[PDB]
């Protein structure tokens, strides 16, 4: 009989930026580099462009990842509605979804939460989130020794303003009450972008500065957060893979 193949679906809620296309070949590659392991089959679907799996094919996937986006997760574009519908279906199937940034926000929306512009304003920087260690099982996604804090790239202007009643907050920060959360055993959401790196961040900063969206001094302060430190990238890959591939007991 056939071996059980491992299949993951990536919902690309962003187009490929010029820098990401040139440097990495696009976000598919970025996501697979971050979360993929040898021998898995990753299908991506450019949901932002209205490309979706068929509902009948959802069962073949072992897990789903929803990417970041420049779009607002509270908007009502047809593709966002369709994304919410398909996420609702996957959620009902109890299939694993890792939501990243926009994805974190979409899952919150589907489960009755509210997303909108953050009360304390946008973040574009390397930040640190405080872990709610009391909500985390030793030897689950976060390893045997749970960190007090994790460094992650932040690139967002919106947040979960109202958490679904079914969500457990796993991390917060001074300005954002919901930096990471889980719902049941199959939904896991991070507001930051574990897939980003210094090069991706700095290129966004440069571009948004050039557009006149932020001041030079803001751009400078954003970049300064990563001049001498990086995100906890290896730890994020471990956590996310632990969750997405059920590599450790559930939390």
Three-state SS sequence of 139-169 = CECCECCCCCEEEEEEEECEEEEECCCCEEE
Distance of alpha carbon 192 from the chain centroid:
6
> In the beta sheet, which residues pair with residue 150?
129
- Cβ atoms of 200 and 31 within 8 Å: the answer is no
CA distance 69 to 71: 5
Distance of alpha carbon 91 from the chain centroid:
16
- Cβ atoms of 10 and 65 within 8 Å: the answer is yes
Q: In angstroms, what is the resolution?
A: 1.6
- Cβ atoms of 67 and 13 within 8 Å: the answer is yes
For the sheet containing 63-66, what is the strand order?
41-45, 7-11, 63-66, 97-100, 187-190, 180-183, 167-172, 123-131, 149-156
CA distance 215 to 151: 24
Question: Crossing angle for the helix pair 102-110 and 78-92, nearest 10 degrees?
Answer: 70
Which strand (E) or helix (H) includes residue 33?
Answer: helix 27-35
Residue 126, SS3 per DSSP: strand
Neighbours of 117 (CB within 10 A): 12
Token pair for residue 201? 């961040």
Architecture label for domain 7-244: 3-Layer(aba) Sandwich (3.40)
Helix, strand, coil shares of the chain as percentages rounded to 5? 35, 25, 40
Q: Is 25 left (phi over 0), alpha (psi -120 to 50) or beta?
A: left
- Cβ atoms of 240 and 194 within 8 Å: the answer is yes
CA distance 239 to 180: 12
CA distance 222 to 202: 8
Separation in Å, CA 192 to CA 53, 75, 241 = 26, 20, 16
- Cβ atoms of 176 and 86 within 8 Å: the answer is no
């Amino acid at each position: 009989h056939m071996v059980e193949q491992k299949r993951y679906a990536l919902f690309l809620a962003t187009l490929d930026s010029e820098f990401v296309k040139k440097t990495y070949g696009g976000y598919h590659n970025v996501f697979v580099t971050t979360f993929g392991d040898e021998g898995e089959h990753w299908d991506s679907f450019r949901v932002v462009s209205g490309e979706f799996p068929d509902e009948k094919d959802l069962e073949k996937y072992d897990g789903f990842v929803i990417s970041g986006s420049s779009h607002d997760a509270f908007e009502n574009d047809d593709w966002i509605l369709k994304l919410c519908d398909i996420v609702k279906k996957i959620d009902e199937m109890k299939k694993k979804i890792l939501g990243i940034c926009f994805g974190h926000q979409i899952i919150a929306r589907v489960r009755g939460g509210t997303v909108g512009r953050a009360k304390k304003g946008p973040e574009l920087k390397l930040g640190d989130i405080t872990i709610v260690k009391d909500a985390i099982t030793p030897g689950s996604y976060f390893g045997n020794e749970i960190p007090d804090s994790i460094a992650i790239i932040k690139c967002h202007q919106d947040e979960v303003l109202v958490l679904p009643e079914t969500a457990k907050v796993l991390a917060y920060s001074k300005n954002y009450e919901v930096e990471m959360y889980s719902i049941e055993d199959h939904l896991f959401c991070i507001q930051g972008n574990p897939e980003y790196n210094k090069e991706i961040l700095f290129e966004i900063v440069d571009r948004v500065l050039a557009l006149g969206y932020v001041k030079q001094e803001f751009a400078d302060a954003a970049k300064a957060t990563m001049e001498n430190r990086g995100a906890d990238r290896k730890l994020w890959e471990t956590i996310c893979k632990n969750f997405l591939k059920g590599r450790v007991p559930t939390n």
